[PDB]
Amino acid sequence: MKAAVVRHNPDGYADLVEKELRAIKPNEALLDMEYCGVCHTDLHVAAGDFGNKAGTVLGHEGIGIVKEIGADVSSLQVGDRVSVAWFFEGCGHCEYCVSGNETFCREVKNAGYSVDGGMAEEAIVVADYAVKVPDGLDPIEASSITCAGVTTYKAIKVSGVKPGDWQVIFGAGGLGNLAIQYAKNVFGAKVIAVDINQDKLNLAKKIGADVTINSGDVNPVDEIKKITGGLGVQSAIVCAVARIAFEQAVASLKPMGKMVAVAVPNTEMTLSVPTVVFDGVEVAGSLVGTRLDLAEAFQFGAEGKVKPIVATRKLEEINDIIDEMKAGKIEGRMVIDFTKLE
Amino acid sequence: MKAAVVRHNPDGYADLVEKELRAIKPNEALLDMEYCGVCHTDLHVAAGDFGNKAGTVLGHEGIGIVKEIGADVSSLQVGDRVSVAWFFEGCGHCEYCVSGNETFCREVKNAGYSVDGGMAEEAIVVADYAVKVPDGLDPIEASSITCAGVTTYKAIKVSGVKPGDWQVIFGAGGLGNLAIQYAKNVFGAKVIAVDINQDKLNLAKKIGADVTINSGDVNPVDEIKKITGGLGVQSAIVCAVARIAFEQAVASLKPMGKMVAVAVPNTEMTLSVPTVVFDGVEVAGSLVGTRLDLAEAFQFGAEGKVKPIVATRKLEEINDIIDEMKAGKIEGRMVIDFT
Numbered sequence: 201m202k203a204a205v206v207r208h209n210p211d212g213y214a215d216l217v218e219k220e221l222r223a224i225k226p227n228e229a230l231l232d233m234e235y236c237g238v239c240h241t242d243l244h245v246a247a248g249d250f251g252n253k254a255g256t257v258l259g260h261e262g263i264g265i266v267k268e269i270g271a272d273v274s275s276l277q278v279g280d281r282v283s284v285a286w287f288f289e290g291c292g293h294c295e296y297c298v299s300g301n302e303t304f305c306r307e308v309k310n311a312g313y314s315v316d317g318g319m320a321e322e323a324i325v326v327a328d329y330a331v332k333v334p335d336g337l338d339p340i341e342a343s344s345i346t347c348a349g350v351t352t353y354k355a356i357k358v359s360g361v362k363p364g365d366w367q368v369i370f371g372a373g374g375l376g377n378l379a380i381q382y383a384k385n386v387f388g389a390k391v392i393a394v395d396i397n398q399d400k401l402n403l404a405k406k407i408g409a410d411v412t413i414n415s416g417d418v419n420p421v422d423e424i425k426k427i428t429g430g431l432g433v434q435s436a437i438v439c440a441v442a443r444i445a446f447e448q449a450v451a452s453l454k455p456m457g458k459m460v461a462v463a464v465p466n467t468e469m470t471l472s473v474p475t476v477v478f479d480g481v482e483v484a485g486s487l488v489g490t491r492l493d494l495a496e497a498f499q500f501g502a503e504g505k506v507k508p509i510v511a512t513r514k515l516e517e518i519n520d521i522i523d524e525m526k527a528g529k530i531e532g533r534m535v536i537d538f539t540k541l542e
Numbered sequence: 543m544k545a546a547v548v549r550h551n552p553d554g555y556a557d558l559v560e561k562e563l564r565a566i567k568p569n570e571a572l573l574d575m576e577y578c579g580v581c582h583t584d585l586h587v588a589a590g591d592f593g594n595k596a597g598t599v600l601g602h603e604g605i606g607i608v609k610e611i612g613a614d615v616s617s618l619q620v621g622d623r624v625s626v627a628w629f630f631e632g633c634g635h636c637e638y639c640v641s642g643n644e645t646f647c648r649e650v651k652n653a654g655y656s657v658d659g660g661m662a663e664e665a666i667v668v669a670d671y672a673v674k675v676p677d678g679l680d681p682i683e684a685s686s687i688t689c690a691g692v693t694t695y696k697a698i699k700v701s702g703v704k705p706g707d708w709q710v711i712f713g714a715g716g717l718g719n720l721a722i723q724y725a726k727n728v729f730g731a732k733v734i735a736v737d738i739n740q741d742k743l744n745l746a747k748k749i750g751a752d753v754t755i756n757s758g759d760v761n762p763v764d765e766i767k768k769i770t771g772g773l774g775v776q777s778a779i780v781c782a783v784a785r786i787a788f789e790q791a792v793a794s795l796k797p798m799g800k801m802v803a804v805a806v807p808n809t810e811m812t813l814s815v816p817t818v819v820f821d822g823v824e825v826a827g828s829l830v831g832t833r834l835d836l837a838e839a840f841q842f843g844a845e846g847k848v849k850p851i852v853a854t855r856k857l858e859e860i861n862d863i864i865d866e867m868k869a870g871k872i873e874g875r876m877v878i879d880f881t
């Protein structure tokens with residue numbers, strides 16, 4: 201079958217190879233992939249940024265149909281639609297797994313990085329770890345919920361925001377788009393969206409930001425303080441990569457407020473220690489979520505409470521998509537479409 | 543009466559002056575002071591780090607005996623022993639005061655900063671905010687618990703350590719010594735202590751530290767990772783005034799560990815955002831403790847679960863104490879003795 205793999209000398213691009221999968225084990229399933237989103241993380245992995253992963257099949261935003269199950273599998277049956285996400289397998293028995301924090305398992309397998317992923321016509325998954333896609337959830341949208349969706353949903357959980365609190369999202373496009381939809385439509389927060397780009401802010405307004413702030417035209421911090429009534433927001437979710445965003449996010453918190461990073465800044469962030477102490481603020485960050493966070497994130501999509509921006513492309517375009525992504529030309533996700541039929 | 547106050551041009555030191563206290567209001571009490579500990583925060587205040595507070599009486603580790611009460615006071619009576627802590631008065635009705643988080647009150651009065659403190663022979667307190675010192679707790683010891691002890695007790699609650707977890711305390715001075723005693727004797731943590739001063743570490747070993755690390759001799763981060771079986775600690779309490787302690791603290795945490803900032807050196811710290819994003823780590827500040835945190839912290843001292851290391855000094859000695867503290871010379875707390 202056809203797969204996108206890391207090149208022998210990782211150079212940022214994929215090779216498109218013929219690959220024959222090994223036979224599945226008793227606890228596994230073989231999928232026929234339908235979709236697989238292309239992510240910034242795929243670019244990093246293909247570039248060698250995390251080590252030389254030559255020959256590894258890319259993709260951790262996969263959606264697929266179970267074609268075969270191993271003899272011990274009871275969770276899935278042939279014909280089920282399931283997911284291939286970043287969190288592909290944990291060991292099941294360590295402190296992180298058993299405490300309910302399995303993405304931190306030290307023996308974690310991540311799809312498209314430390315184990316073959318879903319950017320291929322077929323993939324193997326461990327059955328009990330391939331989360332089912334609910335009926336009601338468009339499967340092209342589900343591919344984006346496996347990464348951007350579960351990340352922003354879980355980040356907003358980690359923030360501790362409760363109905364009626366103010367939360368600000370720094371960065372209106374990309375992840376920010378889905379962060380705004382979850383914050384407003386699922387958690388019942390009052391939402392401020394902050395961005396340098398008016399177009400995207402105009403879009404945020406459409407998908408449920410109560411207030412938008414163009415950060416090129418003003419200092420966001422002073423306006424955020426005014427909007428919330430002097431104090432600041434309960435929490436900030438930082439979706440932007442500009443270090444100034446992280447600085448402004450922290451500066452905007454009311455006392456005991458919490459900043460949750462979902463992106464990492466291009467240059468190192470600093471905190472003023474007397475402010476962290478005298479205002480008791482908290483900084484944390486979040487990446488994807490357990491299988492249960494994923495199930496929940498899917499269910500809100502299935503109810504129509506969030507709607508990711510997606511478009512489809514053919515597998516052969518992988519390297520065009522990579523260049524578009526480096527050039528900054530993509531709103532939301534491009535999603536490789538393996539389906540023949542419908 | 544004699545008081546130590548912020549200088550007219552704040553320079554890090556005190557003037558000793560004669561002050562006459564105003565008459566008390568109906569919800570207030572007048573104290574004859576017994577003791578007031580010296581805290582690094584007094585030095586930051588006197589240096590102007592938090593703005594110019596020229597003329598304000600310093601001190602927020604005060605212990606004194608109620609001499610007079612206002613007409614509306616029912617919580618205290620003459621002869622009660624009470625405390626004068628950083629959290630000196632909150633508004634009572636804001637979302638911080640009503641949710642169990644009163645030290646974050648934006649209208650807070652802070653002893654020794656925004657209101658006259660306890661480093662003087664007498665002090666006025668707001669009676670319902672002046673937490674009684676339990677019998678069975680030595681007043682000199684109570685002075686340390688009034689700031690050092692309640693700050694670290696509450697910081698250890700904020701860290702979320704549970705019995706059996708590994709916790710590291712950066713800085714084994716006045717704050718860090720008590721932090722070790724609470725983490726070990728009250729919370730049941732396994733405790734690492736990290737400092738550059740070996741005598742403070744030798745003391746840390748005697749009062750409860752399971753492992754001590756001299757960080758002029760070694761890389762504390764690598765050592766911590768070994769002690770704990772490879773991953774690092776569940777939490778780090780930073781009681782150290784050095785920027786690098788804050789950064790070693792973040793680095794020493796296992797995934798989902800939490801760093802709690804207690805010391806307020808006038809510094810920035812570098813925040814490793816990849817560490818919070820990929821390893822789940824949290825950084826939070828903690829600010830002294832509520833009136834109930836202090837009552838709890840005091841009860842542990844009364845029961846002998848913690849024992850503050852203290853030495854008494856004369857008020858006239860306040861500027862000598864400040865230089866000892868800047869030189870890293872103090873074990874435990876120096877306590878001004880008004881008795």
Ligand SMILES: [Zn+2]
Pocket residue numbers: 238239240241260261347348
């Ligand atoms: Zn992704």
Ligand SMILES: [Zn+2]
Pocket residue numbers: 290291292293294295296297305306307
């Ligand atoms: Zn595990």
Ligand SMILES: [Zn+2]
Pocket residue numbers: 581582583584602628689690
């Ligand atoms: Zn203090």
Ligand SMILES: [Zn+2]
Pocket residue numbers: 632633634635636637638639647648649650
């Ligand atoms: Zn208040």
